[PDB]
């Protein structure tokens, strides 16, 4: 009945076999809470390596994918390829994809639909721009982004929503509560109660316990700290 | 002499089983010793491809970013490509320019970074169909080449790939030769005589087992960047287009 705590580590564009090997060694040897679902998001070039080296209890995510299984899309990878390597998740709609690479809500929706149809789990990311937060339209913006994802989700069992603010723990709770309210009204009470909504702002060993104590925060999508030993402490934030 | 160069761009195709089969075929084929062969694999399979391909065959990434590390979810860097043992990256492919909106400026920044990091670059240029129809092919490809050239210090590790636009139902070896000769003339005056003489300019249009010999006989065509046929048995014949 309770939502299982979920901690994803987004390595972003970082690592080589040496540094990631050391990272993976530390995670494999660490005492990790049985009550946390852990997923590591590796650069595409290291997905195979990461899946081979990581203990099976730790999931592997791709950091992006495209919206069809194959084709004339030089530089892209598909859910079929991600599954072929043994990864079970993909991060979609990350703030950096939206803002540096201009990925639209429409495209992200198409990717979500395809990844889910192909049997992957999706960490679906949403978050408003700084100017939008300053203008007081956080809710309007994140609801639009969430609707664009939701319209492409037939089954929420393998979806985790990640909120990335452009930020206080109280401010985090406020957005998470509003997002869960959106799910309740626009999808169902069952989906609202069961869907993990994870926090994708700045998460460190210093602030993770306070964030994890918030009623509507179900875990984290961790950035820089996911490359460091303190990722273990973040996984164990509730203990 | 300009060594004949054949790159096989697999694009977004394959899995370990199917790419393993295609690699096994290449490893066992009678490939001309006078062709420099490079296979362009999806990023997720670059490590695999380098492990399985004979050392004589190069491996290319299909794209990369412009710094070694950072907050660029979904991107890979030249440092990572080198880490995997690959020695090439394809940059500025028509699909990156068109589908993904990569600018001349960004492509130039990527070229400069990949070269600084010690990779070879297959630098792609080519006009859109509407531009070819307007008769401004030359203007467009020179603009794109300038953006690349401004970011190349040593041309020894660059191969230039010309991609004519796909007809989509609405080209000739002579037409390929015409563009390649113009590009070489551009290099002569904008870079140097030596760079024009030594730089491979490869053809990235529709290359098949059936048209490859005629294309390879053109005076200013130095090889191919092969799309669909790189997934077919005839890729071996294309590698052997001079013979």
Swiss-Prot record, chain A:
Gene Ontology biological process terms from the UniProt entry: canonical glycolysis; gluconeogenesis; glyceraldehyde-3-phosphate biosynthetic process; glycerol catabolic process; glycolytic process; methylglyoxal biosynthetic process
Assigned GO CC terms: cytosol
Keyword Ribonucleoprotein (UniProt): no
GO MF: methylglyoxal synthase activity; protein homodimerization activity; triose-phosphate isomerase activity; ubiquitin protein ligase binding
Gene3D superfamilies in alphabetical order: Aldolase class I (3.20.20.70)
Gene behind the chain: TPI1
Catalytic activity as recorded in UniProt: dihydroxyacetone phosphate = methylglyoxal + phosphate; D-glyceraldehyde 3-phosphate = dihydroxyacetone phosphate
Pfam family, one: TIM
Cellular localization per UniProt: Cytoplasm
UniProt-annotated catalytic positions: 94 (electrophile), 164 (proton acceptor)
Entry function: Triosephosphate isomerase is an extremely efficient metabolic enzyme that catalyzes the interconversion between dihydroxyacetone phosphate (DHAP) and D-glyceraldehyde-3-phosphate (G3P) in glycolysis and gluconeogenesis. It is also responsible for the non-negligible production of methylglyoxal a reactive cytotoxic side-product that modifies and can alter proteins, DNA and lipids.
Sequence positions that bind substrate: 10, 12
Top-rank lineage group of the source organism: Eukaryota
Chief subcellular location: cytoplasm
Lineage: Eukaryota, Metazoa, Chordata, Craniata, Vertebrata
Stated name of the protein: Triosephosphate isomerase
Pathway noted in the entry: Carbohydrate degradation; glycolysis; D-glyceraldehyde 3-phosphate from glycerone phosphate: step 1/1; Carbohydrate biosynthesis; gluconeogenesis
Source organism: Gallus gallus (Chicken)
EC number: 5.3.1.1, 4.2.3.3
Family under the similarity heading: Belongs to the triosephosphate isomerase family.
Subunit record text: Homodimer.
Keyword terms, alphabetized: Cytoplasm, Gluconeogenesis, Glycolysis, Isomerase, Lyase
């Amino acid at each position: 009945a309770p939502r299982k705590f979920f901690v994803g580590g987004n390595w972003k564009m970082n690592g080589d076999k040496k540094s990631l090997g050391e990272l993976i060694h530390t995670l494999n040897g660490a005492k990790l809470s049985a009550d946390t679902e852990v997923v590591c998001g590796a650069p595409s070039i290291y997905l195979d390596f990461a899946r081979q080296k990581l203990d099976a209890k730790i999931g592997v995510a791709a950091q992006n994918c495209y919206k069809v299984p194959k084709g004339a899309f030089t530089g892209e990878i598909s859910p079929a390829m991600i599954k072929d390597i043994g990864a079970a998740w993909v991060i979609l709609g990350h703030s950096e994809r939206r803002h540096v690479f201009g990925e639209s809500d429409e495209l992200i929706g198409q990717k979500v639909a395809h990844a889910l149809a192909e049997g992957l789990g999706v960490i679906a990311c949403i978050g408003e721009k700084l100017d939008e937060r300053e203008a007081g339209i956080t809710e309007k913006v994140v609801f639009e982004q969430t609707k664009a994802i939701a319209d492409n989700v037939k089954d929420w069992s393998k979806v985790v929503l990640a909120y990335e603010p452009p930020a206080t723990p109280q401010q985090a709770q406020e957005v998470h509560e509003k997002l869960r309210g959106w799910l309740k009204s626009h999808v169902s009470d069952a989906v609202a109660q069961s869907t993990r909504i994870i926090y994708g702002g700045s998460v460190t060993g210093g602030n993770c316990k306070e964030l994890a104590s918030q009623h509507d925060v179900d875990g984290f999508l961790v950035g820089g700290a996911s490359l460091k030993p303190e990722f273990v402490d973040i996984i164990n934030a509730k203990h």
